[PDB]
Nucleic acid binder design. Structure first.
Ligand SMILES: [Mg+2]
Ligand SMILES: [Mg+2]
Lengths: 18, 354, 74, 95, 52, 93, 143, 81, 49
RNA sequence: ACCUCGGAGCAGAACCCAACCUCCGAGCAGUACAUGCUAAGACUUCACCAGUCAAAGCGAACCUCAAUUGAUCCA
C-alpha cells in the first residue's frame, strides 16, 4: 500500500533502464 | 501520507547510477539462485515463513551423546590427498569416466558412510521424523556408533530396520538379531519402543523391548527386564514409528522398580515414557545408537490381539469434517433447484400428517 | 496480487481460496516460469543485486484434513 | 389484472405466469434462464450449463407472482410421479 | 468469411454439434467425443445453416 | 456364527471367512450392518442382499478381479521396494 | 469388564509422515504464477556446482531428509572427476539407496527445460528409477 | 423393435467407425505431406532470382509452377489413356 | 395413520377396508373434482404396524 | 450532434461517482474439437434480467483476446 513502510517494494523499471 | 521503511529496502544497496557498469544477470539460473538465497534472509516485512508452521525453531537444543572423536584433520586431509592422487595415477579410470561406464562398490560406499558420516544423516532423519520431539522432548543426540538390527521371518533373506525402514508384525513376530561393536568392559541397555499406537493416552508409548547390562556384544546374556512384544498398529490407524535406542553405561546399574512380570501382557504395565525413563536413569547411561521403522496393520496384528493381549481388536477410520454450507435462505435467489438438496437429511419421500 | 499458498487463480486473474483458513498478505521474491519469455528476458536484463518482490496472497488452513475415530470393536 | 370479473365477481389469474413459472407449495417459484436456447454457438460450456439451470425467484418476484395467480395454483398437489415432489416442502429452515 | 456448420457422427447416431468453419475450406471430418457411446468418433459436416 | 453355518457349503464358507475376515467378531460370527434407509424393513433387506451376494460371489471363484490403481498402487509399490531388501544366507524363525 | 479395553475413541497419530503416506495429506496447491510449484510432499533438488554435484530430497516445509554430494568423503575417495556425469550417476544411485533406507520412494522433480534436456540429469533420473524410486507422487484422496 | 433396430445400427456403426478412423488419420498425414511438398516446391522455384521483391521473381515462379502443374496433369491424362 | 385409525375405534379391520370405509371413518378426504383418483398407500409407518 | 458495449482521465491510496466533459477503441479474429458431463463455494456494473470465477468428482490426454453484442413471443 502507499501509506505503508513496504511501499514501492515491487519497483523494477528503475533498475531496467531498457 | 507516507511511512519510512522499517529497515533497508531490498534493492537500495545496489547503485542506481552507472547501471551500464553493473554486470547483468545473463541467465535465468543465477537470478534464481540469488532469489532462493535471499528468500531465507530475515526480512522485516511479512513473509510466508512467518505464517506457515516453523514451531518457533531457533532455540539451542540439548545434546546428550558421546563427544566427537578427536581426529587430526591435517593428517587426515593429507591421507585423502594421497588416496586421490593414487586414483589419479591410474588411467583406466580416466578411460572409464570418458567412456561413461563407472560403477561403484555401493557396499563399500555405504560402509564408509556408516563409519564416517552416518551419524549426522541419521540424526537429521530422526529429527525430521520427530523422534527427539517425541522421545527426549526436544533434546537432540547424534548416534555415534552404527547399529545393525535385522528381523527373521524365514530361511535366507533379510528384513533389516534401517533409518526409517518398514516392517509388519508378520516379519516382527519374534525378537530380531541385534549387532554392534563393543569392548569387553562396557555394559549396554537396548530399548525398543513404539511412538504411535497408544490407545488410551495420546502422549505415552508402548515398550516392546528392554535389555539391561549387555556385557559387550553378548546380547544373549543381558537380563530381560521386559520381554519382547511384537508391534500392533491398529487396523484403521495410520503408520506407526518404532525405534531402537541403544545406550552405554559406565557402571553396572540394576533396577526392579522398572522390571515387568514374566508375561507382562498388560498395556497398563507396558505404559512407557522415554523422557521419564531418561530422567530416572539420567546419570548412568548415554545414548549412542538409534534405528527405526514404520509399521502398518497386517493379518498378524489380529492374532496378536487374539492371544497375546486377550482383547477385542480396535479398528479406526479416517473421517473428514462435514461439508460447509451457508445458512439456508427462505428465498434462495438465483440458486439452482438442487440448492434444497444440500439441507435434507434423508433422501426419501415424506408425508407429514397423512 | 499474486496467488500464494492455497490460493488459486481463475482464467480472468481472479484470486479464490483453495482451503478454509485465514487470508494473509505477504511480499515474496518473484521468480517467473522459464517458459514465460517476457518475464525471463526482463529477469535477465537485471543486474547482480536485483530481486522483484511481488505481493502475494496466502490462506493458512484452519482445521486438519481429518481425524481417526473408533468405529468397531471386533 | 381483473381483480373482479364481469361474470362471477372473482379474481382472475395471469396465464403468462402459469406458462412460465412453477410454484412449489412451500412458496418458492422456479423459472428458466433467459436466452438458454438462443445463440448457443457464441456461448461457453460453463455459460450454457448455468443457463440450463432451474433457479429460484426473489421475494419480491414471488409475492408478485402470488398476486398474479389465484389460490387454485397454490394448493397441495399429489401427482403420481412428480419430479418436483420432494421440493414442495422445506427442511432444516430456521426463521 | 467464417461459416457455422453442423457435424454429425456416424456411430452414436443422432448426435450433432455446430462448429465454425472457413467457407473456402473443404468439408470437415473431425474426431469428437460422442456422449451416447462414451468415446471419440468421427464427425462429418452436414447441412450447413449459418453465415457469420 | 460363520463356522457353524451348515446351510452354507464348506468351501464357500471357508472362502467367505478368508475374504471377509474384517467382519468376524471374537466369537467367530460374521457381522453385517445397514444404514441406507430409515426403515428397518429396507435395512434388513439390504443386509440379506449383502449376505446373498457374498455367498454367491464366494461360490463362483473363477471371477476375474478387475485391477484398480487408486489406493493399492501405493501399497504394492511400497511392498515391492520392501521385498527389494532381502539378501542374507542364514536366519530362522 | 476388561480394563485393557480402554481405547480413547479418538486416536492421535503423531507421525509427520502418516497423513502423506496415507495420501490424504494436503499439498500446498497454488502459487500458479511463479517457479517452481510447491504442490508436492517431497522434492528432488539438484545443485550442480563447478567442483561438485549434490542432490537432496526435501519435504515441502524445508527440512531435508536425504542427500548425496560428491563432497562426502565416502564416495569422494572412490569416484573420479567429481563434476562428471558418472559422478552424478553415482550420486543418484547412492541417494536412491539411502532414500530407500529412509523409506521414501515417492517424490517429484521439477527441472528447467535445459536441465531436463541435460544428459547428466536424464541419466540421473534413470539411475533413480533403476534404484527403485518412482517420481510423480500420487494424487490426494478427496483433494 | 425400434429400440433393438437402433441398438443394432449403433453396434454396426462402431465397427464402421474404428475401420474408417485409421483411414482418416492416414488421409490427414497424406494431405499434410502434400501441403508441405507444395510449400517446398514454391520455396524451391524462387531460388533463382536477381532483384528485388516478390513483384517479378514471384510471378515468374508462379507461372513456372502453373506450367509444371499443367505438364503433370497432361502426363496423368496420358497415363490414364 | 392407518394404525391410529384402527386403534381409535375408527375403521374396523374385522371387515374389508375400502375407500368408503376410510371416508366414513374420516381418515382421508377424497376430492373427485381436483382430479384425485383415490388413495395411495405409503410406507411411513411400516414398522410398529 | 448523439442513443449500445469496452479502456484511460476527471475520480491520486477499498468500492461507487456526472457532464451536448477530455481522449482512444468495439459490432471481430486466430487455434483445438473433452470449446465433454457434473458439482462445493463465491463475485456481480449499485434493482431485476442478464453476466463472471471455481475446488472436488465422472470421463479423456498424460483455450488466446477488452469490448467483439440482442430478452420474450413467434418462425
Ligand atoms: Mg448486484
Ligand atoms: Mg476439476
Amino acid at each position: 500500500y502507499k501509506t505503508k513502510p513496504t511501499h514501492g517494494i515491487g519497483k523494477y523499471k528503475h533498475l531496467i533502464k531498457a | 501520507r507516507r511511512t519510512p521503511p522499517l529497515g533497508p529496502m531490498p534493492n537500495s544497496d545496489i547503485d542506481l547510477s552507472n547501471l551500464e557498469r553493473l554486470e547483468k544477470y545473463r541467465s535465468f539460473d543465477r537470478y534464481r539462485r540469488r532469489a532462493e538465497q535471499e528468500a531465507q534472509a530475515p526480512h522485516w516485512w511479512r513473509t510466508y515463513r512467518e505464517y506457515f508452521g516453523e514451531k518457533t525453531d531457533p532455540k539451542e537444543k540439548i545434546d546428550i551423546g558421546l563427544p566427537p572423536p578427536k581426529v587430526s584433520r591435517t593428517q587426515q586431509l593429507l591421507e585423502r590427498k594421497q588416496a586421490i592422487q593414487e586414483l589419479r595415477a591410474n588411467v583406466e579410470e580416466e578411460r572409464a569416466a570418458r567412456l561413461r561406464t563407472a560403477s561403484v562398490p555401493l557396499d563399500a560406499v555405504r560402509a564408509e558412510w556408516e563409519r564416517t558420516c552416518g551419524p549426522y544423516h541419521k540424526q537429521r532423519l530422526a529429527e525430521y521424523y520427530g523422534l527427539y520431539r517425541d522421545l527426549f522432548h526436544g533434546a537432540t543426540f547424534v548416534p555415534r556408533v552404527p547399529l545393525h538390527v535385522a528381523y527373521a521371518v524365514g530361511e535366507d533373506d533379510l528384513m533389516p530396520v534401517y533409518c526409517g525402514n518398514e516392517v509388519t508384525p508378520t516379519e516382527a513376530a519374534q525378537a530380531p538379531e541385534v549387532t554392534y561393536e563393543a569392548e569387553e568392559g562396557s555394559l549396554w541397555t537396548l530399548l525398543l519402543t513404539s511412538l504411535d499406537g497408544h490407545l488410551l493416552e495420546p502422549d505415552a508409548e508402548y515398550l516392546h523391548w528392554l535389555l539391561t547390562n549387555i556385557p559387550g556384544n553378548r546380547v544373549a546374556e543381558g537380563q530381560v527386564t521386559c520381554p519382547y512384544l511384537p508391534p500392533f498398529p491398529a487396523r484403521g490407524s495410520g503408520i506407526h514409528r518404532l525405534a531402537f535406542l541403544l545406550f552405554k553405561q559406565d557402571q553396572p546399574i540394576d533396577f526392579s522398580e522398572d522390571a515387568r512380570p514374566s508375561p507382562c501382557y498388560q498395556l497398563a504395565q507396558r505404559t512407557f515414557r522415554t523422557f521419564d525413563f531418561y530422567k530416572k536413569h539420567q546419570e548412568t547411561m548415554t545414548p549412542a545408537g538409534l534405528s527405526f521403522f514404520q509399521c502398518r496393520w497386517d493379518d498378524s496384528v489380529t492374532y496378536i490381539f487374539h492371544q497375546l493381549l486377550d482383547m477385542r481388536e480396535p479398528v479406526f477410520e479416517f473421517v473428514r469434517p462435514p461439508p460447509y454450507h451457508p445458512k439456508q435462505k427462505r428465498f434462495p435467489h438465483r440458486q439452482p433447484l438442487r440448492y434444497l438438496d444440500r439441507y435434507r437429511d434423508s433422501h426419501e419421500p415424506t408425508y407429514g400428517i397423512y | 496480487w499474486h496467488p500464494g499458498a492455497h490460493v488459486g487463480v481463475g482464467k480472468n486473474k481472479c484470486l479464490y481460496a483453495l482451503e478454509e483458513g485465514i487470508v494473509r498478505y505477504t511480499k515474496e521474491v518473484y521468480v517467473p516460469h522459464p517458459r514465460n519469455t517476457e518475464a525471463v528476458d526482463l529477469i535477465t536484463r537485471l543486474p547482480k543485486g536485483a530481486v522483484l518482490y511481488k505481493t502475494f496472497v496466502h490462506v493458512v488452513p484452519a482445521k486438519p484434513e481429518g481425524t481417526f475415530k473408533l468405529v468397531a470393536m471386533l | 389484472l381483473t381483480y373482479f370479473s364481469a361474470r362471477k365477481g372473482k379474481r382472475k389469474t395471469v396465464k403468462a405466469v402459469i406458462d412460465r413459472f412453477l410454484r412449489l407449495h412451500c412458496g418458492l417459484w422456479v423459472r428458466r434462464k433467459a436466452g438458454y436456447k438462443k445463440k448457443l454457438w457464441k456461448k461457453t460450456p460453463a455459460r450454457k450449463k448455468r443457463l440450463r439451470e432451474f433457479v429460484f425467484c426473489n421475494k419480491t418476484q414471488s409475492k408478485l407472482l402470488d398476486k398474479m395467480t389465484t389460490s387454485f395454483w397454490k394448493r397441495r398437489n399429489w401427482y403420481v410421479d412428480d419430479p418436483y415432489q420432494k421440493y414442495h416442502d422445506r427442511t432444516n429452515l430456521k426463521v | 468469411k467464417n461459416i457455422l456448420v453442423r457435424m454429425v457422427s456416424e456411430a452414436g447416431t443422432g448426435f450433432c454439434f455446430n462448429t465454425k468453419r472457413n467457407r473456402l475450406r473443404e468439408k470437415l471430418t473431425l474426431l469428437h467425443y460422442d456422449p451416447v457411446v462414451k468415446q471419440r468418433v468421427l464427425f462429418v459436416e452436414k447441412k450447413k445453416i449459418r453465415s457469420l | 456364527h460363520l463356522a457353524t453355518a451348515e446351510w452354507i457349503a464348506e468351501p464357500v464358507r471357508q472362502k467367505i471367512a478368508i475374504t471377509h475376515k474384517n467382519k468376524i467378531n471374537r466369537l467367530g460370527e460374521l457381522i453385517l450392518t445397514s444404514e441406507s434407509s430409515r426403515y428397518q424393513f429396507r435395512n434388513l433387506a439390504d443386509c440379506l442382499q449383502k449376505i446373498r451376494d457374498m455367498i454367491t460371489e464366494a461360490s463362483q471363484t473363477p471371477k476375474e478381479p478387475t485391477k484398480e490403481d487408486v489406493k493399492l498402487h501405493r501399497i504394492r509399490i511400497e511392498n515391492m521396494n520392501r521385498e527389494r531388501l532381502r539378501q542374507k544366507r542364514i536366519h530362522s524363525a | 469388564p476388561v480394563e485393557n479395553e480402554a481405547v480413547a475413541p479418538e486416536f492421535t497419530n503423531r507421525n509427520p509422515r502418516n497423513l502423506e503416506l496415507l495420501s490424504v495429506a494436503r499439498k500446498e496447491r497454488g502459487w500458479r504464477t511463479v517457479f517452481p510449484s510447491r504442490e508436492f510432499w517431497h522434492r528432488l533438488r539438484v545443485i550442480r556446482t563447478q567442483h561438485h554435484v549434490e542432490a537432496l530430497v526435501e519435504h515441502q516445509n524445508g527440512k531435508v531428509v536425504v542427500s548425496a554430494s560428491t563432497r562426502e568423503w565416502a564416495i569422494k575417495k572412490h569416484l573420479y572427476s567429481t563434476r562428471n556425469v558418472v559422478a552424478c550417476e553415482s550420486i543418484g544411485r547412492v541417494l536412491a539407496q539411502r532414500c530407500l533406507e529412509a523409506g521414501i520412494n515417492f517424490m517429484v522433480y521439477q527441472p528447467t527445460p535445459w536441465e531436463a534436456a541435460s544428459d547428466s540429469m536424464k541419466r540421473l533420473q534413470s539411475a533413480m528409477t533403476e534404484g527403485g524410486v518412482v517420481l510423480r507422487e500420487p494424487q490426494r484422496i478427496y483433494e | 423393435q425400434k429400440r433393438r433396430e437402433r441398438e443394432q445400427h449403433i453396434a454396426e456403426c462402431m465397427a464402421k467407425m474404428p475401420q474408417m478412423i485409421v483411414n482418416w488419420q492416414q488421409q490427414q498425414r497424406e494431405n499434410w505431406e502434400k501441403a508441405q511438398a507444395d510449400k517446398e516446391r514454391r520455396a524451391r522455384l524462387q531460388a533463382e532470382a536477381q532483384e528485388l521483391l516478390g513483384y517479378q521473381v514471384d510471378p515468374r515462379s508462379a507461372r513456372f509452377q502453373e506450367l509444371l502443374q499443367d505438364l503433370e496433369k497432361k502426363e496423368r491424362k496420358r497415363l490414364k489413356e | 395413520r392407518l394404525q391410529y385409525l384402527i386403534d381409535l375405534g375408527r375403521v374396523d379391520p374385522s371387515q374389508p377396508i375400502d375407500l368408503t370405509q376410510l371416508v366414513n371413518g374420516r381418515g382421508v378426504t377424497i376430492q373427485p373434482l381436483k382430479r384425485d383418483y383415490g388413495v395411495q398407500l405409503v410406507e411411513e409407518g411400516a414398522d410398529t404396524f
